Predict the 3D structure of the following.
Amino acid sequence: EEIIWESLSVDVGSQGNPGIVEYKGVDTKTGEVLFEREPIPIGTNNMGEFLAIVHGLRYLKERNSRKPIYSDSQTAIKWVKDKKAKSTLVRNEETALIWKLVDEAEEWLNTHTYETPILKWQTDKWGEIKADYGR
RNA sequence: ACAU
DNA sequence: CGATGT
Ligand SMILES: [K+]
Ligand SMILES: [K+]
Ligand SMILES: [Mg+2]
Ligand SMILES: [Mg+2]
């Protein structure tokens, strides 16, 4: 603790895993939805969590905001730190879209800079992250 | 085991 | 119960 309330919180929602993947980012304090990604027909939970963080980085950079990002995903936080999403999802025609988005997110990380702290939301102490889908 |  | 990840 404590929660850094002046922050952006992100989370993934899915119908199946692998399955339909979406994500959103919210103001940690107010819950206002700041962005939402159109559902992607096939992806994994961790790919969605990764895309959500990267989108948060791009969102905050465009707005000249120094707020941190919270995610509850140990995996996605690491993948962003590494600038490499180490997903097991097969590459085929069905997964081409998510893989294009993941590849492009990695490419963005490799061509841009940011100071945004990426923080682990401590679900066991604080409850569900504010961007949770309730599924 | 831990995080989803 | 299954799957995605470190
Ligand atoms: K949920
Ligand atoms: K497991
Ligand atoms: Mg999550
Ligand atoms: Mg959730």
About this structure: Residues 16-19, 44-47, 49, 73-76, 78-79, 86-89 of chain A lie near DNA strand C (CB under 10 Å from a C1').
